[PDB]
Design a protein around this ligand. Structure first.
Ligand SMILES: [Fe+3]
Ligand SMILES: [Fe+3]
Ligand SMILES: [Zn+2]
Ligand SMILES: [Zn+2]
Lengths: 340, 332
């Protein structure tokens, strides 16, 4: 029999991590089975004008608001751990900080539900923070964890930003791998990849003037996406004001497609990867954002990345292509905003 | 101040994966024996209409929806640096632990557990004749997405070395090359002499919350002596691993007095025909609970985008595992 990945199992390589993903397409050929918050909450610790758990009061903010995590997992003055070469048990130093970013004072409006202007303000804030912390730390990680399924206790819409005095696992790896690719190809790995997907279209989910979001060829989560700018850009702080407002639009369309997929607020973990502030030639980088969502079949049926996946290799049944196709099928205007 | 990993955040290295773990210590200061409809119960028909025998001991059957098959055609060769795929064959089986639909591992007698070890050895020997990697595992608990409560494990064989295997293989090999002794053998002897991370210890086995553990109460179970695959255990090591397992899983359930979920699996030398003296058999247990029967750890956000992070240290986790009894609470 002749090989046809739409029918036959195989593994796909993720050039950003150097790992493979096992795909079992015959397992996803079964048809598909069927199937209100206040703008302000009195007890919400993230709400404007409320006191946090430590007693501090948030300001009467009108847009975004950033504050130092009251239980920061890292600090800036941590002493250095001693050096060691123990090939079995050894530790290194860890300094950094963590901040929380409320997207807007409206306790009930998630990203796909915010105006493009509000979202543009969010991008701004991400830039300012990345720009400020990068003055001191080489890796600044902006991210968001949304939804109870992702463990989020508090539903007020917000993200987080952690700064590290070191390049965390994912960052050093993508840094390294992108660098080799560039040393080898003379062009940035993700800039080229964008070209290829723009040309193909099978995994494309949102395309705007300056951005493209696709379910990557090597996606691990069912509806995982990769949002990248179409031009070479190293960090979020390097976007032009036009790419910036367009990113706002791209985000709104992407997350609206996610919510419309199951017509529910779509949980996920997302974040941005950009060049580290380590003072090196960072040409090889291409800024991008990953969105890793757990839902698989409905609002209640998700994917569990356990067992075989933890002990051996990530595996998926639904193809990245079928995923993208289901995502293209829905509208890119949030259901709550269209009323349909 | 003087650095003090007992109070100060730091990162610990995992030599088996070559990755770091960020630790922030400052932040941690009824079922019947048989079901008439159970697809895994003896004598019942499975979803496809096929019927299980009135089995005794373990029962192993080919997954009715296997994710891999033995004759999938090959993928075309390619060296594309951006979009490339590879072939994939194997098969998957399900291993019912015992005909008792309500008895989880910690609740089985040691004889019973010895029989599971035997099945694991047999399945591994058999599939290894055809596939280089055999992965025995167990996903237990609704929290791990397990639908059928009947106690059971799974075994998937693969025609290639999956990610974790390829990596452990390579790192153990490089270490063995550098040190002339297997990484995990030295590791075990090292912990056996410390005690700091020990959670279970028997004549032939040791279970510790590894130094680089990622999950809160994650453990690494392994033999004190050098053993390449599960098929290599002597019968004594074998009966001893049954006991070590009962003890470890019993402690896990006692921690919060509930049936503790987790995903666990065995890593041993691949059947690839090369010298694998660098290997050392071992099992990993990655449990999600963190503070109670209903409070778990979510591995997300920063962890998915940057790096694993934990507040409770491995030393604290092990101390908590040692503080309870190793006899299951229902058996107690
Ligand atoms: Fe990335
Ligand atoms: Fe391992
Ligand atoms: Zn709120
Ligand atoms: Zn049963």
């Amino acid at each position: 029999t002749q090989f046809n990945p739409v029918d036959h199992p195989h593994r796909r390589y993720n050039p950003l991590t150097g790992q493979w993903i096992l795909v079992s397409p015959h397992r996803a050929k079964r048809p598909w089975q069927g199937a209100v918050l206040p703008a302000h909450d009195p007890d919400c610790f993230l709400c404007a004008g409320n006191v946090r758990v430590t007693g501090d009061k948030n300001p009467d903010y009108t847009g975004t608001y950033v504050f130092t995590n009251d239980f920061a997992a890292l600090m800036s003055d941590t002493p250095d751990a001693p050096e060691s070469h123990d090939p079995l048990m050894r530790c290194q130093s860890a300094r950094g900080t963590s901040r929380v970013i409320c997207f807007s004072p409206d306790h009930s409006k998630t990203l796909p539900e915010l105006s493009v202007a509000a979202l543009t303000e969010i991008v701004k804030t991400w830039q300012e923070q990345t720009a400020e912390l990068g003055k001191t730390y080489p890796w600044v990680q902006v991210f968001e964890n949304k939804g109870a399924a992702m463990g989020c206790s508090n539903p007020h819409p917000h993200g987080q930003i952690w700064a590290n005095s070191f390049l965390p696992n994912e960052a050093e790896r993508e840094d390294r791998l992108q660098k080799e690719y560039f040393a080898e190809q003379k062009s940035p790995m993700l800039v080229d990849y964008v070209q290829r997907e723009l040309a193909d279209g099978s995994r494309t989910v949102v395309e705007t003037e300056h951005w493209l979001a696709v379910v990557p060829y090597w996606a691990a989560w069912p509806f995982e996406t990769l949002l990248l700018p179409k031009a070479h850009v190293l960090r979020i702080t390097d976007l032009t004001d036009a790419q910036r407002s367009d990113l706002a639009l791209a985000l709104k369309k992407l997350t609206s497609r996610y919510d419309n997929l199951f017509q529910c607020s779509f949980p996920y973990s997302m974040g941005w990867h950009g060049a580290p502030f380590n003072g090196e030639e960072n040409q090889h980088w291409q800024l991008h954002a990953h969105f890793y969502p757990p839902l698989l079949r409905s609002a209640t049926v998700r994917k569990f990345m356990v067992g075989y996946e933890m002990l051996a290799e990530t595996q998926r049944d639904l193809t990245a292509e079928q995923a993208a196709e289901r995502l293209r099928a829905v509208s890119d205007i949030h259901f709550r905003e269209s009323g349909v």
